Structures are given as structure tokens and as C-alpha cells.
Amino acid sequence: KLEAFASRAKIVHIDIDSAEIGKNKTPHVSVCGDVKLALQGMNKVLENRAEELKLDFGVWRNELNVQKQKFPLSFKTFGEAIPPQYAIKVLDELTDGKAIISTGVGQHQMWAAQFYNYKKPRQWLSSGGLGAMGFGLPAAIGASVANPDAIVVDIDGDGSFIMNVQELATIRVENLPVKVLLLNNQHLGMVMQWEDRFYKANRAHTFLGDPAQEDEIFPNMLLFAAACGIPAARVTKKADLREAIQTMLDTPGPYLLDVICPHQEHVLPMIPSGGTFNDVITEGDGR
Amino acid sequence: TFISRFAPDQPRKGADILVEALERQGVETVFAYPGGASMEIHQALTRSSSIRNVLPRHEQGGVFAAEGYARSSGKPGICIATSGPGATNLVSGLADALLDSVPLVAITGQVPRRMIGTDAFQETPIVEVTRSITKHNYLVMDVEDIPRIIEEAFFLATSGRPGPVLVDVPKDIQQQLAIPNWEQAMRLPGYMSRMPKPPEDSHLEQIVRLISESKKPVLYVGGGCLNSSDELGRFVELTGIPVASTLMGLGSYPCDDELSLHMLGMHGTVYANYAVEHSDLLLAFGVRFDDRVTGKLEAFASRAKIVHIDIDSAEIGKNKTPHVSVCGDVKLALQGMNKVLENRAEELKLDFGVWRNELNVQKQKFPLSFKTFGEAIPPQYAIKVLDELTDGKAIISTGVGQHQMWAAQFYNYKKPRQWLSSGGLGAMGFGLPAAIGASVANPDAIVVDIDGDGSFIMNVQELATIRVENLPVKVLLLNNQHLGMVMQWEDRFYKANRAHTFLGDPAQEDEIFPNMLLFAAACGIPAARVTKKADLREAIQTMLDTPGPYLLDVICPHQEHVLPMIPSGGTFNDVITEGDGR
Amino acid sequence: TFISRFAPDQPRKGADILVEALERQGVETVFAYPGGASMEIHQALTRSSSIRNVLPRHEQGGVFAAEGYARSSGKPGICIATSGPGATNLVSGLADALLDSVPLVAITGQVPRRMIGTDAFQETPIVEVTRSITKHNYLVMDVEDIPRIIEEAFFLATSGRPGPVLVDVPKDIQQQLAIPNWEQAMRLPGYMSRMPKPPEDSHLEQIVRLISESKKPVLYVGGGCLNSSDELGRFVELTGIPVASTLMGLGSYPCDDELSLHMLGMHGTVYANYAVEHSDLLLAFGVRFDDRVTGKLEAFASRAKIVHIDIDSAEIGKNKTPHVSVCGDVKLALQGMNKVLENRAEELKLDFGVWRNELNVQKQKFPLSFKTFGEAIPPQYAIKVLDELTDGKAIISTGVGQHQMWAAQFYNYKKPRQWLSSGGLGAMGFGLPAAIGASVANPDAIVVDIDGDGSFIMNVQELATIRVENLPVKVLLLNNQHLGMVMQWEDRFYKANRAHTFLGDPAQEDEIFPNMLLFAAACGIPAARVTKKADLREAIQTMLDTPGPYLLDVICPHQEHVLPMIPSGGTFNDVITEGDGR
Numbered sequence A: 001k002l003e004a005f006a007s008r009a010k011i012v013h014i015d016i017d018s019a020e021i022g023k024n025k026t027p028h029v030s031v032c033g034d035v036k037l038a039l040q041g042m043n044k045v046l047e048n049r050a051e052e053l054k055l056d057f058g059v060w061r062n063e064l065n066v067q068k069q070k071f072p073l074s075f076k077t078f079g080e081a082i083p084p085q086y087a088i089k090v091l092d093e094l095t096d097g098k099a100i101i102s103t104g105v106g107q108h109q110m111w112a113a114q115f116y117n118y119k120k121p122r123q124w125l126s127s128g129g130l131g132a133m134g135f136g137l138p139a140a141i142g143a144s145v146a147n148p149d150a151i152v153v154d155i156d157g158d159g160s161f162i163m164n165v166q167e168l169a170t171i172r173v174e175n176l177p178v179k180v181l182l183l184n185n186q187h188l189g190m191v192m193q194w195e196d197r198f199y200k201a202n203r204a205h206t207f208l209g210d211p212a213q214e215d216e217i218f219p220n221m222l223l224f225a226a227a228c229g230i231p232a233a234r235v236t237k238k239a240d241l242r243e244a245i246q247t248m249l250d251t252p253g254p255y256l257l258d259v260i261c262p263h264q265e266h267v268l269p270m271i272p273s274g275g276t277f278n279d280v281i282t283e284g285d286g287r
Numbered sequence B, C: 001t002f003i004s005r006f007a008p009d010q011p012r013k014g015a016d017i018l019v020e021a022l023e024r025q026g027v028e029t030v031f032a033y034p035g036g037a038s039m040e041i042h043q044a045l046t047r048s049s050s051i052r053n054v055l056p057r058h059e060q061g062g063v064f065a066a067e068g069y070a071r072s073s074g075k076p077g078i079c080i081a082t083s084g085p086g087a088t089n090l091v092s093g094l095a096d097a098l099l100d101s102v103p104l105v106a107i108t109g110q111v112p113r114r115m116i117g118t119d120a121f122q123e124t125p126i127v128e129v130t131r132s133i134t135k136h137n138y139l140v141m142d143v144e145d146i147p148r149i150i151e152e153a154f155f156l157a158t159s160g161r162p163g164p165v166l167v168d169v170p171k172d173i174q175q176q177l178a179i180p181n182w183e184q185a186m187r188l189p190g191y192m193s194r195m196p197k198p199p200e201d202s203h204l205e206q207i208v209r210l211i212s213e214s215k216k217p218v219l220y221v222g223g224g225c226l227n228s229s230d231e232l233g234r235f236v237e238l239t240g241i242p243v244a245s246t247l248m249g250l251g252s253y254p255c256d257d258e259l260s261l262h263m264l265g266m267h268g269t270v271y272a273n274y275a276v277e278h279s280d281l282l283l284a285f286g287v288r289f290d291d292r293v294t295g296k297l298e299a300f301a302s303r304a305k306i307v308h309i310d311i312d313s314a315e316i317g318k319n320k321t322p323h324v325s326v327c328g329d330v331k332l333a334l335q336g337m338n339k340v341l342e343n344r345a346e347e348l349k350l351d352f353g354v355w356r357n358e359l360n361v362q363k364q365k366f367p368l369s370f371k372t373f374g375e376a377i378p379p380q381y382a383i384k385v386l387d388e389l390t391d392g393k394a395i396i397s398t399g400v401g402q403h404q405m406w407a408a409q410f411y412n413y414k415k416p417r418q419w420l421s422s423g424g425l426g427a428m429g430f431g432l433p434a435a436i437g438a439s440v441a442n443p444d445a446i447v448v449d450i451d452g453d454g455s456f457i458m459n460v461q462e463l464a465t466i467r468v469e470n471l472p473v474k475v476l477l478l479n480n481q482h483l484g485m486v487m488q489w490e491d492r493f494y495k496a497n498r499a500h501t502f503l504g505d506p507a508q509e510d511e512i513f514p515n516m517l518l519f520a521a522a523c524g525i526p527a528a529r530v531t532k533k534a535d536l537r538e539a540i541q542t543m544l545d546t547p548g549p550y551l552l553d554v555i556c557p558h559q560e561h562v563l564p565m566i567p568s569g570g571t572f573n574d575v576i577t578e579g580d581g582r
């Protein structure tokens, strides 16, 4: 809700597009220009008047670090099932936060944003405004061609990954070292989450598996990779996840890791669409 | 409680539904010229007892009269035309109303729905033609939509930033019988959700703060302040900030006032442009930073903190980038700031007498000046005499050109909506039909069209309208036998090489041509010509004292130049203060 | 071999490149009204010795004069206006030229390129406004494109189905110096590849075959035949087929001819509409089957084999579905068919004397008729007298309304391009400026504007143009004090309830208002009024014999009705043959 967003703040908006300044939120101070130059100019002023300004927000930072410890990002581990949040944390660790990450769209996209510590811009390649499923695999192709010495991982969902699965042939033929971390929950997860919250878990065409063999992983993404000569593996037990990701990273060239996840996971926290901070949802899932 | 002329269960023609839709909006006057596609609407108008039609002699006269009606009253002006050639004759007025933010509802008859797209008789795709020169437009495709669309048209034309809305009505919809539903909700969810909210105290406090920290503040007021006369006046009392006005803002703050810097811009006063040039705080209230005012944008108020209050979010930062901005009604922002200024009066201790004194020095060194040659009538002097003899209380409409500038410079408008002039589009021929609409809207007022000879002849046919409607319209015709403003640019920038700016007869070069007195005589309008400056005062007095319409042909030497002049795209250092075509 | 005023390696302003581009097209006359955005073009015009400018008093007068120039000569008419309010004043003429297929090139000044889209001074997005009412338009974005775009504009305006093309020229492009390249190829590959080819003998043989097999053939000729006068005449000799003409086609076949059925349609003769109603072969040459002509489409030529020859493939089968169709120039189709008809003359043995005799029976039972009341002047009679005293050799322009119909019915045009009338859009105010353009194009011709009092006053300001340019324009003003055609529909369909159709002064109801003689006097144009039918013949003779311009105010009883009348969308069985407003 725009009226509730930063309701008691003086809003400084620096944007290179004059049409964005005051489009939704009306600022108090505005600068139409390159934020790179504005930062450089402000850094000079801040450095000169350093002893004069005496800036210290430790009281504000401490008030926030209290919220940071009371309400951190959290996930639950059920038996030996693989938490998707945990899989991304392991990838972050084993790649030292230096991987280029592309994603599809949905729950896995949010978890890839929440649980990976990107150290530099342009490590994060994700469709935000349009939010187009099927972006992750071809985007990783372009990132790898542009950065042939980088670790490139497509953190994809099973719905998003199959939309442009044909680009596996491109990856093999171009011999691109694209890694696929497929968070497979057998569902259109983000739409499933909204079904659980707002439609009493009534499923309206969000299950992506085969209802005849309901407990079978469908489709078999390993055979999609095999069809294009791309080595692949599936992991289901949380104990096996660390070595599986390590194998994906150590194996030269392309690799697909099918990471089976319980579908009842929910992306948290969640402020409902058009809501305020007082409406934030901090607990619950599809169980 | 509205009283319909039909039973709530009685079917009537769509044309009758449309006329009652106008009645329910409070419409009392329309400017409608009949044709085949709108005959039904005209029949329904004769059945209305509360709506009067003023029949113009040209639909461009109709739309310009609707503009004058609107500009002089704050109410929406309503013009009606038939399809095809009637609709296309509205186009200049639609564009004029959009560029000047004038509330206008234009209704056009259209060919029957099934004929649309077939190159039918008198068919024009007017919705397509006018989409870029209207705030919004409609093609009514069912008689059931008439109540809703008419209501949305008036709402869109008058709310937010005002503008023209065109409603295209196929003839078969006018004839179809139906029972109207006056309770339909409007379908403007996006527009209504983006309407500006009342200004927050957060933004209003910061402005009052910037005022107390500034030493050279200048008010920069425009057409957006036409409904904030009282609030702006109270704001000037509490701050003592000098007021510079745009062409569209004239009269929002009284011109004959001590703090008035008068008009700024290309032909603004030297001291108004000086104030803005050297200001440290520019309060831009209801303005759009157009090129006539700013010149070179980078040089305009180059050392000022710019506060821009505008009801249109798209105008904020469009040409000049402000430091502080408020998207809202300037009337409410002034009210909120006046409360803060009144409470913290003894705390703020606002005094800009040092700045005002620096400006009053420029005001006395470089005032508006004109030269008197023998017994020839200075046009500037004629307008000053009109100001005196009318006590600055006349409604003034103008054409476009030199006379328009002199009418802005040398008449002290005391209230907004006395000044009716085409500023953004600058359409010649506006003055006479605009005076028609202003007089119909203000039947007890003194209404004077200060027109040029080129502009006056473009819509001279509306003299018949003035006589037939018995409107007391006065015409002060500043006759220089030339397209004066274009002539002035020929003198300055093209070595006085004349390229089709002389409007007289080259065979009888020293004869006043045409004879505008006979145009007035043709329409039974008393008229006179004055040439000697000594006779001018009595001639204007005769025009004012003679009841009903009157045309005064005021002969002027054509070599006059509007001064001062900042060349297009120039800076304050480029201002031209002397010279003419002699 | 063209002779430039500049060296082939000498840079000149874009405005000079544009004027020379006009010179290289053979342009001799333009109708240009100056403003800020087109000052450079006007300066460059004074430097041309081969191009003359006729300064109108309103840009609508400018474009309508360009139309009259084009309609009366077969050459393209050229009008020029400034940006904003100048450009929007062209709009009615652009739409008029598109609906009537008149070749026209309109040039508008525009704000500098960098100002476009910023709501600059006098900015109108005229290319967007006029896209749907022009054949094509351009926004010139570089001075290098001026030669190519001007050449394409003239080519598009004059080739194929003629129409108006607008060229928008930003002011900075007019000032930029450049060396023009006059050898650039046009970029119209799609348009040029779809231009109709010469008609194949395959299609022409089939038509001549259908003629020999038919017993009731009717020629249905329109505006597309204006350049086929000789070929159509030869075609009628070889076939003996009677000729029915549209409003736009009048004069293609001589009206005072034995085989002439005169005009068909809503106000066409009973015998012309009869012929089409009962024909078995309809030769539709250069027509577009508009609703005024056809009425109810299913009933129009319901038992006829329809041959449609049109240069625009989009018109073939648009409203009426033909049996045989030829997409090409009707001039060439007539030439090809004339060869076949001349060779197989003795073989074909064409004789439609039985059909012609059946039509000549209708021609004598139901001819065009008018009634004489006392000494009041019948408008129909006034036009017949003008026809006699000018020997049918005058160029006739008209306004729109009853007088327009009577000018079509009661004048025997011997050649095409004597008839200049707004048919598709039907724009009032066309007659006077169109006569200006026709007289400039034909300075030795008798040019008469047969105008109505409503139409004449709309562009009355062009009387100043006529005097200043010393054009021998005659005005035959059929003054009925009403918007006559709308009044007629009030009488027929609204029980004579008047809805704003009276143009006089209701305070002095029996006085002729306005006094059009004083409009003419204001512009130094000799004038007279005639009221008694006995005086009419000498009055018209005086108008013709008096050198230079002349206005004749012909007072007519307003209760006249144009007859016959087939109601809109009706059939031949619905034709109204009697009655008026008495």
C-alpha cells in the first residue's frame, strides 16, 4: 500500500528516468541523474565535512539489529527431506558466494534471492518485473558465454526449467559449463502457495507430475539431460546433498542436479499484495 | 433534487437522454451549430427549458466561445457540432483547451454506427483525429452508455488538471428509445486512484522552512492559481514575497499591487525576469516551465532552490528539475502553508525588505515604456486608457500577437478570469468568440475584446452572433494593418524583409483595409474609428457608454515593437530593451 | 532543364531547399499564411521569382483555395501554414480533399526537433492528428530528406487515387544549411509495386460483350472520369448508352446533351434514378457507390450486371459487389474499349433506342421543376439565368446545402472541372476560397461562387483576399436567411420545428440579416441586392459585366425544398417529388 510505505520518512529519490520520479510515491527531494555521479559527489561532501557532520546512527542500527535477531530468515528441516533454502545455502558455501546465479520464477527464485549472499552486482540474473518462467536456463547460457571462467548456476524450478528445456542441446553443443540446481517440488510452487493461503488449498492445475503415478518424480529431468549428453544426478536425502552439489561443481562442463524438495514449503515472510507491514505473515506452510 | 421532463419509466430518444444528462450536470448554456448528424440533439435542446443555445456562425467560433465561457467562469464550456466538417471545425479549439488546461466538453454527432468506417456521408474519424489533442474522448456505441459517459466527460474535464473531453454520438444512438439509468457508476478506476491527495504537513513544513532560510524568494504563479486568489493573497501577506506571473496566471495576484512584479518571460518585465534570475528560492505554483517563460532552461533560476507545486505529476520535473515538489492542489497547499506561517509568525520573523528594495530599484530603472509619436495613437496607451475608464474591472479577451502582449502588459487585472487569452497554442481568432462566451457567462460584466486586425478578421463572422444574441461585447481593435508579431521578428532577425505580413491593400497602400466599421455595420453593430491620440479617450468612453455591442477601430503606427524581448532560447543577459521598426 | 538560384555546391537553408523542391515540381502558386514556425519558408518564398503566394485571411481559406486551384486545373494545390493553430486550421480541408480525392500538398512549420513532445510553444502533433484524414503524411527529421520527401509527397498526391499529403517541417530543419541532392530515389516500393497496370484486353473484351448482350444499359460516371472527357464522349457515341452522373462527376459528360440523364442519387432526377433502378447493365466508371447515390444498397441496381472500373482496388466491392471488375485508370479502359467498339461496329450492331425511348418518357413525365411565387426569385431560376448569361462556360464553386443542389441541378456544365463542390465531407465555407483558387489557376475564366448565406459567412474574411489579389470572383449569393438543407429536413421529418436554423435577427425578423453588401463594401468589392424576379436578369448581367469582383445578394423565399428527394437509406419507390415548407 503506497500510502503506508515509508509513511513517516523524508523520501530522496535519485533516478536517471525523469518519468519515474513521483510516479507512484511522491518524494521530498529528487535528483534526475546517474546515481553513480550523485554518489561520487555526495562522497566528496561527506569526506570533507566528516569531522563537521559527525554522523552516527548506531542507535538506529542497534534498533534494527534487534529486529534482525528476533525475526531472521528461517526454514524448517523435516526428517531427511531436503529444505530448498538449505540447498541454496550449501551452494553459497561451496561456491564461496562467487557464482553467477540465474533463476526461473516462483518459490525457488525467492529462496535463491534470500539464501545466497551475492557479493557483487551482476551475479544475480533474475526476471523481476515481468517475472517470466523459463528465463533461468537460457540466461545462464548467455552469462557463461559472457563469463567463460565463472561458476554459472541456474537455480531453476521444475515448471520453469521444462519451459525452455530445449536449450540443454545448446549448452552441450556450445560446451558451456552451466550447472543446473533444479529445486524440484513437482508443483507450480508460488501459485500453489497462494492456493494454500487464500483458496483453502484447492488445487487448480498446479501439480506438474503424473496423477496416475502420483508418488513418482515426473518428468524425469535426468533423462532430459541425458538426451543432450549432459551428466546428471538426483538427490533426495539431506545428508547426500552436500556431496551431490560438490560433485556438480567439480564435474567439468555442464551438470544437472535434480534436488527433490517437499512441496509444502512456503516462501516467508509474506506481506500480502497491497498490504502494510502490520499484515506481514511470518509463519505457516502447506502442512 | 432534479426534476426530469420525462417519467422514470418513460422511454425517450437518446438525444433527450443526452440533453437531460447535461441538465443534471447544471449546464445552462451550450454553443451548438446544427447539421444532419446532430439534428436529433438540436430537437432535444428546444425541448429543454433550462438550457439555452447560442448559435455561432462557425464551429470554431462555437468552441472558442465555450472556452471563453469556461475561462471566465470556472464552469465547463459546452460546444456541439455535427459530424464531418462540423467536427473538424472544432479541432483548433480542442487543441487550444488542452494546451491551456481549460475545462471543455465537446459533443459531435456521428454517422450511424453501422456506417462507421465505410467513408459515409460527412464521416470523419474524429475520435482518432482528436485523441492527441484532448484530455480524453469517447465514441458512444450504445444508448445505455449516455448517462455514464456524459458524467465521466464532465468529471474528467473539470477534475485534476482541467481539459477538453470530446463525446462522439452516432445518429442512430440519438434516435434509439431507452430508459436512462442515472445511478451508473463511473468507470475511471485508474484515473480516480491517481488523483492527488491533500498535501501532507511533511512537505508543507519543509517549504515554510526553505522560505525562512532564503533571502531572495520569488513567487512564480501561473494558470494553476486561478482558483487560489484569496489563498495566494494571504500567502503574500504572511511572507512578503514578490509575485511574478505567467501569461496564464495574470490576475491571480493583483497587478496594481506593491509586491507585483507583473509578467515574466520572453516579453516579461525586466524586473520580473531579474528577480527570477537572481533568486535563491523559486516558488513555482501552478506553472509548467514553458519555453516562453524560461528561455534557456539551464540559465533559468540558475541559483535558486526550486519548489514546484503542481496537480499533474507529469509536469513535475518535465523541463526544470525541482529541489522540493508537491503533487496536489495549490489551493490546499497554500491553505496549509498559511496556517503554519500564521502560527510561527513571531518565531519565523520573515522580512525580505532588502530583496524587495533591490527589485524596486530595477522596477524604477527599467519599467515598461512606450513612445508617443506626434498625434499617432500608441497601442500601449489605448489599453491604459481602457484600464482607467473601466477601473480595471473589465473581462478582457484577446487575439494573438503584439496587441495580446500589450493587453497583458498595460492592463491591471485585479482578479483571475478577467484575462482570457490563448497562451499555449496561441490561436488567432480567439478573442471575439471568447468574448461571446464570457459575456453569456457574465451578462452584467464589461467585456472587451482587445483584438488585432489579423486575428479579428479570422472569426469576423461572429459579429452576427453578437448582434443576434444582443451581447454587450466591446471590441477594442488595435489596427496596425500588419501581422504585427511576425512583422516584429522580420524587423529584428530578417532585416525587415516583409514576407506576407501586410494585411492592407497594396494598390491603395495608405488606406485602412479592410474597413472594419463596415463589418460591424453589416451586423448592425455601432462602430467608430479613431486616429488622433487626443480623440482616443472620448472614443473609448463612447464605446463603453453606448449600450450593447460596439467596435472601436483604433489606428496605430505599425512600427511599434513589443518590449522587452528575450530572444527564443536566450538568457536574461540577452534581453532586448529598445528599438522598433523605425 | 531546371535553373537553380544557387550553385550546385553552395549550401542554402532548408527552407530554400524546400522552395526549390516546389519549383522543380512546377509549382507556380502557393497559399501560405505566415507564423513563427514557418517564417523561414516565407522568407525563402520571397526569394523565388517563379512562385507566387496568395495570402489568405484564414488557413482554412488557404487549404480550400488550394482545393479550388486543384479541382479546377488538375494540378496539385499547395497550402502552407505555421505550427499549432495554423496547422489545426488546415484540418477541414485535409479531410475534404481526402474524401473527394483532390490532389493536395500541405506544408506545416513545426517547432524545433528537440522541442517535439515537450508541449512547446504552438506545438501540435499534426502528423498524429491528420494521419487518418490524409493519404499520407511526413515528419521531416533531417534537412537531407527534403528533396526526397517533397518529391514523394507530390507523387503520392497526384498518382493513383489522388489525395492530400501533409509534410511537417521543424523550424531548425528550415534554418540548417545543406547542399541538396535532387537525384535521390523515392522510397515507395510497396506503393509503386501495387500501382494498377494498363487494363488487359481480357477484361475489356468481356465488358464490350456484356454491352452487346444487354438491353437496358446505364452509364454511372463519377469523379474518377474528370480526365476522361474525350474518351467517355467517344464511348457514348459508339454505344448510345445514357449517362447518369454523380455530384463529383458533373461535366464529365455534357449536361445539355441528348443522352444525359443528369445527376442520380438522393437529389438526382427521377429519370436517372429510374434508369439505374431498371437497368440490366450498370457501367460504374470512376464511382464509389456512396450512400447518397445508392440509398439502400440491396435495392440499388437490383437487377443489373454491375461493371465497376476503379483505380483503387479497395473500392471494388466495398459496398456493392460487382459482377465484372477492372482495377485501373478508366481513361485507359475507355480507350481500349473504344478500339474494340470501333472495329466490331458492324458486327456488334448496338442499338438501345428502345431503352432510351423508355427513359425519355420518364424524362418528360418527371423533369426537374420549380415554382414561381409572385415576384419572389426562385433560386433554381437564378441559376438557370446565370447558365444562360455565361453560356454554360463558367467555373462554378458552391457552399453546402440547398443552393449546392440547385447549382448542380440547374447549371449545364459542359466540361469537367467547371464544377467545384465539396461532396464527400460537404464542408460549408468551401465556395468562396475555392473560387479564389480557381480564379488564380484560370485567370481568364468566369468564376462564380454560388453560395448560401450560412456557408458564405463562415469564410467571409476571404473577401479581403479577393480584393487584394484583384481576382474577378463573382458571388451569386442565394440568400434564404436559413440553414436551408437542415431546415428542409425539419419540415419533412420534425414537423417544421425550428432548431437553430434561422440565420437572421429575430428582433427584426423581416430584415435581411446580416447585410452581406456591407461585408463586400468593407473589402472594397462592388455589390448589389436583388429581390424582384423581374430585376434578376439585369442584376446578374451587371455582376458579369462589372470588371473584377462582385457580390450579388439574391433574396429567395426560404420555403423552397430541393426536389426530388429519396430519403436516406430509401429506395426508388420512396422518392419524394412534391411539397415544400409552405
Ligand SMILES: Cc1cc2nc3c(=O)[nH]c(=O)nc-3n(C[C@H](O)[C@H](O)[C@H](O)COP(=O)(O)OP(=O)(O)OC[C@H]3O[C@@H](n4cnc5c(N)ncnc54)[C@H](O)[C@@H]3O)c2cc1C
Residues within 6 Å of the ligand: B099, B100, B101, B160, B161, B162, B221, B222, B223, B224, B225, B245, B246, B247, B248, B249, B263, B264, B265, B266, B267, B268, B285, B286, B287, B288, B289, B290, B292, B293, B309, B310, B311, B312, B315, B328, B329, B330, B331, B400, B401, B404, B422, B423, B424, B425, B426, B427, B485, C121
Ligand atoms: C505571442 C505569445 C507570447 C507569449 N509570451 C509569454 C511571455 O513573455 N510570458 C509568459 O508567461 N507567457 C507567454 N506566453 C504564454 C505561453 O506560451 C504559455 O501559455 C504560458 O507561459 C504558460 O502558462 P503557465 O506556466 O502558468 O502554465 P498553464 O498553461 O497555465 O498550466 C497550468 C499549470 O498548473 C497546473 N495546475 C493546474 N491546476 C492546478 C492546481 N489546482 N494546483 C496546482 N497546479 C495546477 C497544470 O498541471 C499546469 O502544469 C506567450 C504566448 C503567446 C501566444
Ligand SMILES: Cc1cc2nc3c(=O)[nH]c(=O)nc-3n(C[C@H](O)[C@H](O)[C@H](O)COP(=O)(O)OP(=O)(O)OC[C@H]3O[C@@H](n4cnc5c(N)ncnc54)[C@H](O)[C@@H]3O)c2cc1C
Residues within 6 Å of the ligand: B121, C099, C100, C101, C160, C161, C162, C221, C222, C223, C224, C225, C245, C246, C247, C248, C249, C263, C264, C265, C266, C267, C268, C285, C286, C287, C288, C289, C290, C292, C293, C309, C310, C311, C312, C315, C328, C329, C330, C331, C400, C401, C404, C422, C423, C424, C425, C426, C427, C485
Ligand atoms: C448536401 C449534399 C447532397 C448530396 N447528394 C448527392 C446526390 O443526390 N447525388 C450524388 O451523386 N451525390 C450527392 N452528394 C455528393 C456525395 O456525398 C459524394 O461526394 C458523391 O456522391 C460521390 O461521388 P463519386 O461516386 O463519383 O466518387 P468520388 O468521391 O468522386 O471518388 C472517385 C472514385 O473514382 C475512383 N477513381 C479516381 N480516379 C480514377 C481513375 N483515373 N480511373 C478509375 N477510377 C478512378 C476513386 O478511387 C474513387 O472510387 C451530395 C453531397 C452533399 C454535400
Ligand SMILES: Cc1ncc(C[n+]2c([C@@](C)(O)OO)sc(CCOP(=O)(O)OP(=O)(O)O)c2C)c(N)n1
Residues within 6 Å of the ligand: A104, A105, A106, A107, A108, A109, A131, A132, A133, A134, A156, A157, A158, A159, A160, A161, A183, A185, A187, A188, A189, A190, A191
Ligand atoms: C511464463 C509464465 N507463466 C506463468 C507464470 C505464473 N507463475 C508465477 C508467478 C509468481 O509469476 O505468478 O504470477 S510462479 C509460477 C510457478 C513456478 O513454477 P516453478 O518453476 O516450478 O517454481 P516454484 O519453485 O515451484 O514456485 C507460475 C505458474 C509466470 N511467472 N511465467
Ligand SMILES: Cc1ncc(C[n+]2c([C@@](C)(O)OO)sc(CCOP(=O)(O)OP(=O)(O)O)c2C)c(N)n1
Residues within 6 Å of the ligand: B399, B400, B401, B402, B403, B404, B426, B427, B428, B429, B451, B452, B453, B454, B455, B456, B478, B480, B482, B483, B484, B485, B486, C033, C034, C035, C036, C037, C082, C085, C086, C089, C122
Ligand atoms: C491561427 C494562427 N495563424 C498564424 C499564427 C502566427 N502568428 C503569431 C504567432 C506569434 O503565434 O507566431 O507563431 S501572431 C500573428 C500575427 C497577429 O496578427 P494580429 O492579429 O493583427 O496581431 P498584431 O497586434 O498585429 O501582432 C501570426 C500570423 C497564429 N498565432 N495563429
Ligand SMILES: Cc1ncc(C[n+]2c([C@@](C)(O)OO)sc(CCOP(=O)(O)OP(=O)(O)O)c2C)c(N)n1
Residues within 6 Å of the ligand: B033, B034, B035, B036, B037, B082, B085, B086, B089, B122, C399, C400, C401, C402, C403, C404, C426, C427, C428, C429, C451, C452, C453, C454, C455, C456, C478, C480, C482, C483, C484, C485, C486
Ligand atoms: C461546416 C459545416 N457545418 C454544418 C454543416 C451541416 N449542414 C448541411 C448538411 C447538408 O451537410 O447537413 O449535414 S447544409 C447546412 C446549412 C447550409 O446553409 P446555407 O449555406 O445557407 O445553404 P442553404 O442553401 O440555405 O441550404 C448545414 C448547417 C455542414 N455541411 N458543414
Ligand SMILES: COc1nc(C)nc(NC(=O)NS(=O)(=O)c2ccccc2OCCCl)n1
Residues within 6 Å of the ligand: B035, B036, B037, B083, B110, B111, B112, B115, B120, B121, B122, B171, B172, C266, C291, C485, C486, C489, C568, C569
Ligand atoms: C443532404 O443529405 C442530408 N441532409 C441533411 C440535412 N440531413 C441528412 N441526414 C442523414 O443523412 N442522416 S442518416 O440517414 O442517418 C446518414 C446516413 C449515411 C451517412 C450519414 C448519415 O447522416 C450523417 C450525415 Cl447527414 N442528410
Ligand SMILES: COc1nc(C)nc(NC(=O)NS(=O)(=O)c2ccccc2OCCCl)n1
Residues within 6 Å of the ligand: B266, B291, B485, B486, B489, B568, B569, C035, C036, C037, C083, C110, C111, C112, C115, C120, C121, C122, C171, C172
Ligand atoms: C512570440 O514568440 C514568437 N513570435 C514569433 C513571431 N516567432 C517566434 N519564433 C520562435 O519562437 N522560434 S523557436 O525559437 O525556434 C521556438 C522555440 C520553442 C517553441 C517553438 C518555437 O517556434 C515555433 C513557434 Cl513560434 N516566437
Ligand SMILES: [Mg+2]
Residues within 6 Å of the ligand: A077, A086
Ligand atoms: Mg539445516
Ligand SMILES: [Mg+2]
Residues within 6 Å of the ligand: A106, A157, A158, A159, A183, A184, A185, A186, A187, A188, A189
Ligand atoms: Mg516448482
Ligand SMILES: [Mg+2]
Residues within 6 Å of the ligand: B372, B381
Ligand atoms: Mg502618453
Ligand SMILES: [Mg+2]
Residues within 6 Å of the ligand: B401, B452, B453, B454, B478, B479, B480, B481, B482, B483, B484
Ligand atoms: Mg495586426
Ligand SMILES: [Mg+2]
Residues within 6 Å of the ligand: C372, C381
Ligand atoms: Mg420562370
Ligand SMILES: [Mg+2]
Residues within 6 Å of the ligand: C401, C452, C453, C454, C478, C479, C480, C481, C482, C483, C484
Ligand atoms: Mg441558407
